[PDB]
């Protein structure tokens, strides 16, 4: 099999910038002078949609900035001014012989300024508690960059292992994430406790926002 | 416009078979060059898996050869992939797509939008829905969140819409996350204005398909 590499595996860059992947084959994808690797952009949630066929053709409806270079065994797309937009996993293929192979995928962010994420915090149900289980969510709202720190406490005590969070995708209407982490604990030990508190540590802000509440109040 | 829809995706035991289907519409499926199955494990990257084109004849990846087929019925505008003895390394989302008359023909400018088989000896669980209630510790200026927690559910995929599709401003509904009990959950929120939440209704929509769970949840202040 013709096996692709792509480089970089991601990038982030600012906003307009020029930004370049490339992606070597193990052999060559020439014949009777085309060359044969094309081209494709996913969203996330999203099928790929084909950017550049035949190594430098730009598939109908793809932006201009869009383009495609190369020959033999090395080709690089290049998006001549990175848009909001842009934010997605990029793949070449090969379609000179089968199997048809995809590189590994490059993933590609766009590098706003700093933004610190609004924190909200949510008690468990009372639906939730009638099922001896309390979920306690806390929701970190359109920050950047991608990494930020979250620490359950409960009356105190930091909780370490009974969390899990989860990211979206960077959004394209201000190139921000989000993120919500949920603690769980049983109905009796969530009884048993009153401050809830989720601390949040990110770049955007000068020192650690704490959003809790008291059970009961 | 010419549309590719996959059915078939779901919950299959491991050495079982998966029989999936595209059907296409606003376009005939004898006037395509081929028509091709490609698949996605999770995180992972793409991998064509099998084509047949417009005289019939099928090519098989030989990472799977010998236990897919591809097929079509131009009666019913439509083709299918079945593939057995299937293993964990075989979940993943399946997608439909079209090859070229043009350029080398192995490229594909048309998909479909990707149904997720998963491999696994677990049961069908449907969610539980809880609401996220805005209030004082989820307001930030004028602007409230609340949302719809999601909980225990097995296989993916969970759909979260609210108001029917009708408010999408300001939604994120997060990827769901591998509980140590084996089961997804996942959370949806929406910010909206404070001044909003006396007077107009919040209803989260969920969709399990995997276990013909639907839930309209009315999200109101506690």
């Known amino acids: 099999d013709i096996q692709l590499t792509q480089s970089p595996s991601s990038l982030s860059a600012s906003v307009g910038d020029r930004v370049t992947i490339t992606c070597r084959a193990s052999?060559?994808?020439?014949?009777?002078?085309?060359?044969?690797m094309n081209w494709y952009q996913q969203k996330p949630g999203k099928a790929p949609k084909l950017l550049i066929y035949?190594?430098?053709y730009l598939e109908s409806g793809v932006p201009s900035r869009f383009s495609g270079s190369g020959s033999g065994t090395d080709f690089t797309l290049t998006i001549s001014s990175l848009q909001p937009e842009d934010f997605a996993t990029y793949y070449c293929?090969?379609?000179?012989?089968?199997?048809?192979?995809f590189g590994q995928g490059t993933k590609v962010e766009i590098k706003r300024t700093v933004a610190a994420p609004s924190v909200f915090i949510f008690p468990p149900s009372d639906e939730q508690l009638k099922s001896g289980t309390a979920s306690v969510v806390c929701l970190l709202n359109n920050f950047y960059p991608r990494e930020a720190k979250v620490q359950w406490k409960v009356d105190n005590a930091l909780q370490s292992g009974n969390s899990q969070e989860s990211v979206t995708e960077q959004d394209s209407k201000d190139s921000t994430y989000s993120l919500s982490s949920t603690l769980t604990l049983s109905k009796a030990d969530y009884e048993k406790h009153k401050v809830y508190a989720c601390e949040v540590t990110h770049q955007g802000l000068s020192s650690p926002v704490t959003k809790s509440f008291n059970r009961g109040e | 416009e010419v549309q590719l829809v996959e059915s078939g995706g779901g919950l299959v035991q491991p050495g079982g078979s998966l029989r999936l289907s595209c059907a296409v519409s606003?376009?005939?499926?004898?006037?395509?060059?081929?028509w091709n199955w490609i698949r996605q494990a999770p995180g992972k990257g793409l991998e064509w898996v099998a084509s047949?084109?417009?005289?019939?004849?099928?090519n098989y990846n030989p990472s799977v050869k010998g236990r897919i087929t591809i097929s079509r019925d131009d009666s019913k505008n439509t083709f299918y992939l079945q593939m057995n003895s299937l293993r964990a390394e075989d979940t993943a989302v399946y997608y439909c797509?079209?090859?070229?008359?043009?350029?080398?023909?192995?490229?594909?400018?048309?998909w479909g939008q990707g149904t997720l088989v998963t491999v696994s000896s677990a049961s069908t669980k449907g969610p539980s829905v809880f609401p996220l209630a805005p209030s004082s510790k989820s307001t930030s200026g004028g602007t409230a969140a609340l949302g719809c927690l999601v909980k225990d559910y097995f296989p993916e995929p969970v759909t979260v819409s609210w108001n029917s599709g009708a408010l999408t401003s300001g939604v994120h509904t997060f990827p769901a996350v591998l509980q140590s009990s084996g089961l997804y959950s996942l959370s949806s929120v929406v910010t909206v204005p404070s001044s909003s939440l006396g007077t107009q209704t919040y209803i989260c929509n969920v969709n399990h398909k995997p276990s013909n769970t639907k839930v309209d949840k009315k999200v109101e202040p506690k």
């Open positions: 052999q060559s994808v020439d014949y009777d002078g085309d060359s044969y």
């Open positions: 035949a190594a430098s």
């Open positions: 606003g376009y005939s499926i004898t006037s395509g060059y081929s």
């Open positions: 797509a079209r090859g070229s008359h043009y350029f080398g023909h192995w490229h594909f400018a048309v």
């Open positions: 293929q090969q379609s000179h012989e089968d199997p048809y192979t």
């Open positions: 047949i084109t417009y005289d019939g004849s099928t």
